[PDB]
Structure formats: structure tokens, C-alpha cells
């Protein structure tokens, strides 16, 4: 838990700048910073007005991104911030009071009905989201899908992730159960396209595995874990990090999604040697909740994708690995697989984790190393 | 709705014979479930004894059964089954089934996983002359 004030209050931390103030001085809702939307607008948010509102470009530098980028929990990544005509719709922003000296931002900004600049902070904390332009999909490109990972045990493939840092990995948090909760278990796997080549020493040692404290195993709810590696990845063209998605994505009802894993191409069946990927479309959920489908086992934590006539899903081996949508000519990390019933049967689509509903949870895990 | 599991196929055998438990849900299909059965008898531990994914792909067997049982399912059918041969004495116990929402790791499911499940309601197995 996090403590509130001298008084000695504590708050679980998923009640940190979540919008309630749950602190009678209101510290929890007092320093809260997030990225908007496919251009990544910088809102800061108003306990007093319970509103978010984007940063002016008036007097902004790249040391407040930077700043800005390390408060969300990305270190020492840094990737670009300009100003851009606010796509957020917002109606009051926060500008900088350069008259006050050498406070922190949130004490130097202040409420502003225009901004001089006319134009409002967008800011990237790391370079992610490009690449090079399973049941039913076809063999992978180098670097088409440059986050993608594969999870070693005991020498063997056992789940997916998705490359979000340098040192950061998304899975899921079935995968690491244990026993197989011990980050000495295993061995990630960048760049590769065939199993045959993930060999002792051509791999990376993991540091810790952190799974989503609410994680329930026995309905698969909030189901995300965290993989930190021991040391960071070199990034280039076959190894790169997908996005995470920010509030305000507005995904289509059927947003046009893709997949990519090492998962059997048949249910029953064994890992793939080569890397696969194939396109399925968002299901919403009341339609996955039909008494024809899951029944009322989704919750607001998953999200399904394929298609209700089958014949394109993930499958076993696909686990924690991505499930992406391009927007703004940006890929974005919108799932990360979890389960579903046989492969590819129609009315048994995939189930993945909703990465947007986990991304503040993300960001505190990042922030806490 | 939440699972409803129910198991049967339990009874009164000699050492030597044989059973078949099955189990099988009412309110969520048991395609949705990895399975484990697990057993306990009076004044003993509870034992996971065997193991199946919602595919079928994984299975596994504590060391004291393996050999003797085999565990297998029928989605369509709606049926999990355990066939137990070769019993002895010190498999008497009440044997229950426990399942989870099933993952897509390409893994087993351990043993132990009936702490955290949905549980029938069991059924009695006897081994004795």
C-alpha cells in the first residue's frame, strides 16, 4: 500500500490516481500525468475539477518530457515531444508558470483557458510500435512482428510476450504459475523465427516475473504478468517494442486486430517451428457472452478476437503472446493471449487479456524497479 | 453460470480390479476446464492424482498411479474420465474433480491445481476383499 499524508493512511496502490480521492488531502490524485489517444496527448490531471487536461507546448522543453517520461515509469527512455493541435477534445489546459522557479511540474502549472502557443505537449517515451512493412496464418517476415518473444522451460517453448522496453516483457500470468514462477525457470527468445535456433546461449536470462496481483487462475481473470530480463535488449531491426495503448484509443467495434505466435497450427497439435501470424477481428464482448459462446465467463478484464465462424485463432503455445492493431500508422499492444476453448471451432473465439484496463498497473511495476 | 461438476463411476472393487470414474458439468460446458482429479482419504492428505488440458494435449500422473490410470476427456459428450486399473488398498479415498478455466500454455496442469477450482461433490472408492 502507499501512505497518504503524516496521519499514516495507506491506500492500495490500484487506488492511486484512479479519479476518486481516497485521501483526505487528496495526494493520490495530486500527481497524476498520462499520454492521450494515438497521438499521445500529455493530460495531467485536476483533483479539484476530478478532470484530466493536456499540457500547453507554451515554455515546454524536452527536460519536462523527460521528466515527465520517468514519472510514468519509463527510466531513462526518451523519444520525442512536439507541440500538435489537441486531438483530445479537451476545453481547459495546464500551462507552465515560468515566474515560479524550480518547482516540481505539477506545483508550476496552472489552469489556462487558451495557450499562447496554441498547441498542446505530445509526447513519446520510447521509440515502439514500427515494424517492417496459430490457426489459419502464414509464416512470419523478419522483423513483421519485432516484439514478438518466445518463453523457454527446460529447453522447451511454453508461452508467448511481447517486448514493451528494453528490459520488459508482456505475458501472462497463467504462464508463470508455479511451479514456474521462478525467473531462474526461464529463458526468453528475440528475433528468432525458428524454434530449432533457440538454443542455450541464444537466448536472455530473466530477472523477475511479476504476475497481476488479482489474478484468479481458476476463471483466468486479469490475466498479465510482467517479465523483467537481466540485462536490456539491443534493438534493431528484428527486435523492437510494440506500444501500449493509451486511454482514449477508440478501437472500432470489430477493430481489425493481428496475432503472431509459435502455437500449434492444429488443436492437439505441437509447436510450430516457424513463427506464424494471422488477422482476426475484435468481438464485442456481450456478443462472446452469448449463452452460445462463453456464457458470461468474459469479464471486463478480456477481450475476444477471432472470428464466431472459427477457422483463424490462436491455440496452445500462442499463450501471452500479442494480439496488436495498427492506428495512427502506430501498432499497439491491445491483448496479450490467454485462453479459449479447442482452436479455431466457430462460436469459440480467442480470449485475451485487456492490456488497456493493466496499463496503469504496468506503468507502477516499471516505475517501482 | 459458474460450473456445476459432478463425478461418478466410484464403488466397492478387490484389489486388483478396476473402475471407471467419469465426471461431467451442468451450467458451463467442461470443454472450458482443465481437469484435475484429486483424492482424499480420511485422515490422510489430499493427493492430485491426475491431470488433462481442455484440448486434451497434457496430461499427467502422480508417481503413485502412473501406469495403472488414465485420464481422458470427451468434449462433445461433455465428460472427463479417469480409468483406474490395477486398484489397490491404498487407493481407497474419496475422489473428486477440480477444474479451472483452462490456459493456452503449452504446459501441464500440476496436481496440486485443485486449491484453487471448482469442486464436484465426489465419490467414493473402496478397495477391499
Known amino acids: 500500500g502507499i501512505e497518504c499524508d503524516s496521519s499514516g493512511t495507506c491506500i492500495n496502490p490500484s487506488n492511486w490516481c484512479d479519479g476518486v480521492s481516497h485521501c483526505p488531502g487528496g495526494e493520490d490524485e495530486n500527481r497524476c500525468v498520462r499520454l492521450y489517444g494515438p497521438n499521445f496527448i500529455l493530460q495531467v490531471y485536476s483533483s479539484q475539477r476530478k478532470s484530466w487536461h493536456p499540457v500547453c507546448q507554451d515554455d515546454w522543453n524536452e527536460n519536462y518530457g523527460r521528466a515527465a517520461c520517468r514519472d510514468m515509469g519509463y527510466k531513462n527512455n526518451f523519444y520525442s515531444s512536439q507541440g500538435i493541435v489537441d486531438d483530445s477534445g479537451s476545453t481547459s489546459f495546464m500551462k507552465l508558470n515560468t515566474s515560479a522557479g524550480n518547482v516540481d511540474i505539477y506545483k508550476k502549472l496552472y489552469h489556462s483557458d487558451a495557450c499562447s502557443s496554441k498547441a498542446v505537449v505530445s509526447l513519446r517515451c520510447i521509440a515502439c510500435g514500427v515494424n517492417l512493412n496459430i490457426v489459419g496464418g502464414e509464416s512470419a517476415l523478419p522483423g513483421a512482428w519485432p516484439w514478438q518473444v518466445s518463453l523457454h522451460v527446460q529447453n522447451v517453448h511454453v508461452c508467448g510476450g511481447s517486448i514493451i522496453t528494453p528490459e520488459w516483457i508482456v505475458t501472462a500470468a497463467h504462464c508463470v504459475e508455479k511451479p514456474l514462477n521462478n525467473p531462474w525457470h526461464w529463458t526468453a527468445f528475440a528475433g528468432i523465427l525458428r524454434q530449432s535456433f533457440m538454443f542455450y546461449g541464444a537466448g536472455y536470462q530473466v530477472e523477475k516475473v511479476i504476475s497481476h496481483p488479482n489474478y484468479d487462475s481458476k476463471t483466468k481473470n486479469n490475466d498479465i504478468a510482467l517479465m523483467k530480463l537481466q540485462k536490456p535488449l539491443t534493438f534493431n531491426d528484428l527486435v523492437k517494442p510494440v506500444c501500449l495503448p493509451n486511454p482514449g484509443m477508440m478501437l472500432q467495434p470489430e477493430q481489425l486486430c493481428w496475432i503472431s505466435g509459435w502455437g500449434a497450427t492444429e488443436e492437439k497439435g505441437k509447436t510450430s517451428e516457424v513463427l506464424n501470424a494471422a488477422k482476426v477481428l475484435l468481438i464485442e464482448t456481450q456478443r462472446c457472452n452469448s449463452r452460445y459462446v462463453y456464457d458470461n465467463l468474459i469479464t471486463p478484464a478480456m477481450i475476444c478476437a477471432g472470428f464466431l465462424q472459427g477457422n483463424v485463432d490462436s491455440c496452445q503455445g500462442d499463450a501471452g503472446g500479442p494480439l496488436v492493431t495498427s492506428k495512427n500508422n502506430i501498432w499497439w499492444l491491445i491483448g496479450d493471449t490467454s485462453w479459449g476453448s479447442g482452436c479455431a471451432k466457430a462460436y469459440r473465439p480467442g480470449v485475451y487479456g485487456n492490456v488497456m484496463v493493466f496499463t496503469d498497473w504496468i506503468y507502477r511495476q516499471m516505475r517501482a524497479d | 453460470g459458474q460450473v456445476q461438476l459432478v463425478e461418478s463411476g466410484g464403488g466397492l472393487v478387490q484389489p486388483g480390479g478396476s473402475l471407471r470414474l467419469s465426471c461431467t458439468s451442468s451450467?458451463?460446458?467442461?470443454?472450458?476446464?482443465?481437469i484435475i482429479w484429486f483424492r482424499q482419504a480420511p485422515g490422510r492428505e489430499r493427493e492430485g492424482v491426475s491431470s488433462?488440458?481442455?484440448?486434451?494435449?497434457?496430461?499427467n500422473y502422480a508417481d503413485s498411479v502412473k501406469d495403472r490410470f488414465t485420464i481422458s476427456r470427451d468434449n462433445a459428450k461433455n465428460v472427463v474420465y479417469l480409468q483406474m486399473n490395477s486398484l489397490k488398498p491404498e487407493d481407497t479415498a474419496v475422489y473428486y474433480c477440480?477444474?479451472?478455466?483452462?490456459?493456452?500454455?503449452?504446459?501441464?496442469?500440476?496436481?496440486?491445481?485443485?486449491?484453487?477450482?471448482?469442486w464436484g461433490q465426489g465419490t467414493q472408492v473402496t478397495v477391499s476383499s
Open positions: 488433462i488440458t481442455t484440448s486434451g494435449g497434457h496430461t
Open positions: 477440480a477444474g479451472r478455466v483452462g490456459g493456452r500454455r503449452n504446459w501441464i496442469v500440476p496436481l496440486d491445481g485443485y486449491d484453487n477450482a471448482y
Open positions: 451450467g458451463s460446458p467442461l470443454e472450458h476446464y482443465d
